[model samples]
Target: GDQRFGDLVFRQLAPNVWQHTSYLDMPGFGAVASNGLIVRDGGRVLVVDTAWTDDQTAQILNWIKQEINLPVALAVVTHAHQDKMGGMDALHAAGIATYANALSNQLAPQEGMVAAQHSLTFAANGWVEPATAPNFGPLKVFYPGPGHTSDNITVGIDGTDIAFGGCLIKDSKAKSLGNLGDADTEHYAASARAFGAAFPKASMIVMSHSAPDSRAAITHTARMADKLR
Candidate 1:
């Protein structure tokens, strides 16, 4: 079933998995991709990476209120992209506890401008940096780095046999890994290999932008990463 929340469209992926995709159809923004997922484990709902705009986060907040009342366990940011972590401020504004890799904490002020320039290419899609971002949640952030970025981290959801791979493993269809001019290509590969080995038995693998619902998706991504290496 498809559920519409303001300018976003959310669909149920599985029994307790829900995906919310942003509909930023504004003129220049075109139709960029941003996703937020709600993973239910042991009676709690964990919200993964937020949208790119406060507006987008608002829609997601509405969805949370409508279908699930569980307090957000934590808001996980997949990477430093404005689209992925940009909305962290809004989520924090809503009083939701947020978490990210320790690297992001160290790099935010240091690499702010570098990220800003990159984001301009997608200006049509709206982006912002609130003065303050989310900072208080029991976190399990692990750096799979020099991979996606110096601070990129994959948020693992315990008991679900799942790990949110963020951009470390792009959509399976991605032809080549584009050097974001910041990440260490070789390190990125190594980190992913480590993550795959660590979760050798994971049943589901979720990316920041793409959906992974079956074992095929997980294995396909693992294969794709191996091929890239």
Candidate 2:
């Protein structure tokens, strides 16, 4: 099931799980697109990653409010990149809670990125560093090492077995690791392997800028990582 609203398209990949795609222009990438997810459970909606701009993100929220009729409980950013957290200020202005790994909070500012107001640092419980499984509502956030960026993470929908790989996984058409300006090429393969192991049953793997239902996406990224390294 899928629906389109202006520049935003909501594709229901599974029951109560929808992938939202929005277009934006990047400095070097030119006219491009980014993705995020909308997870509906009970009477609430949890937005995973915001789109490329506040207006685009607001369009998502507006669609949810008008059509889904559920309050957006919270938002979880998978990384510190603008395509992932660009809507933080919009979410904050809307009074919707937003969270990310502590490292994202620290790295975002350094990368000249806007910071999410709410932090989800689990260091006190020893969940920081390396991969850790943390639950937000019914979804699982997997910090499986790092690939695309040092602070990148994947979001696994509770029962859907769908992993939102953000920028860590490559698209089917991607010949090489897409962006490496902020990537760790030396450890990219190892990171992708760990991410695959973390979600072996992820039948539907979503990337930030590609088709969001390919199992070969991770393998493609790993192969490029090996060749590049």
Candidate 3:
């Protein structure tokens, strides 16, 4: 609550849906490299993004276990950022099957470079072992084109009627969709439209970096996408 270092932040966004934000302080990484999520049905949890390291990953898992003993049924990497996925190694090591977009698996090695560099600075790092590509669950991964990066993918959770919009949507006050250094603005807008169209009647939408709980949240992302032009 007071922004204490190493303490995880928990917020209950909906019924049975909880978010965990981790604060990692590495030598070169500085502070505030965090990740969020939604725990569905309690037993079936969906991690929006993994943490930054094996140790951080372990700590997250330990904290979750303290609250709920169920294993991580569905682990979703919102994007290819190291802060979001560097902990995949620990998740897999603990026998938790991961479900990332097909493109994410392909771009991991490339985007994973950041994690590698952070690992070097931390001095307690290990490479993320390659694991089998996860099969898409009932909710498939549809590209929001490429706004965040070349291979950004947006996942739709059919059962929960919530779309895990990685970095596609920004916080309520964000200006513009987001920068397009590594993304395709045109394609990103198209993808956002498609994701929004796919779930026109949905009640919940889960974003990677920020939390949006109402229909306005969904519309905010739609508006962000509309800004691509």
Candidate 4:
């Protein structure tokens, strides 16, 4: 099912999981769509990433309050990109906790986004549970290495077979890997391979752009990136 609130649309991915879609009109790129995740866990909610601007991000929080009737436990910024963390200010202004890996936090400011309020340490090619908050419910952050960007990370919902691949994994039908401004081409393939190996059970990868897809997108991303490596 789908619920529309202004420019933000939410599609139920599961009984308690929803995927949010919206677009950002870039300066030169026109309208570029982006995706985020919302998980209704127990009595609270978890949001993965944000919209392209503060107002859109605030709309999400408002929708959750009036429709979902739950408080947002936290907002996870998958990377430093504007599509993922452009609403960082809105989230902070609302007093909602924010999360991202150390590297993403450091790179965000340079990308014109604020540094996330919290961060977790990433083990080499491994996932880490942030001690900053509790009951994240299957949420785990894994640093697969430098791909789309050096700070890119994947968020896995352990038992739910869902992973927020963010911009690290490409859309299934994409013929080319998108964006290379800060990409580490030489190690891009390795990161995708590492991401695939780390979450073998993840069926629905909630991508940052386009729709949620399967693990094959990771393979697709790796192959395209390999051409550059």
Best by TM-score: 4
Lowest-lDDT window of 10 residues in candidate 4? 124-133
Summarize candidate 4's per-residue lDDT along 29-97 as a digit string, tens digits.
888888888888889898999898999999988888877998888888888988888999999998888
Top-down lDDT ranking: 4, 2, 1, 3
**Against the hidden true structure, what lDDT does model 2 obtain?**
0.79
Q: Model 2, stretches more than 4 Å misplaced?
A: 122-135
What's the ranking of the predictions by TM-score, best on top?
Answer: 4, 2, 1, 3
The lDDT of each candidate is 0.59, 0.79, 0.59, 0.83
RMSD of 2: 2.9
What value does the lDDT take at residue 219 in candidate 1?
47
Best by lDDT: 4
- TM-score of predicted structure 1: 0.73
Flag the better candidate by lDDT, 3 or 4: 4
Residue 31, model 2, lDDT: 75
Candidate 3 steric clashes? 0
RMSD of candidate 3 to the truth, in angstroms, is 8.2
The sequence of per-residue lDDT tens digits that candidate 2 reaches over residues 57-131 is 899999888778988888888888878987787888888877787789888887666787666544332233333
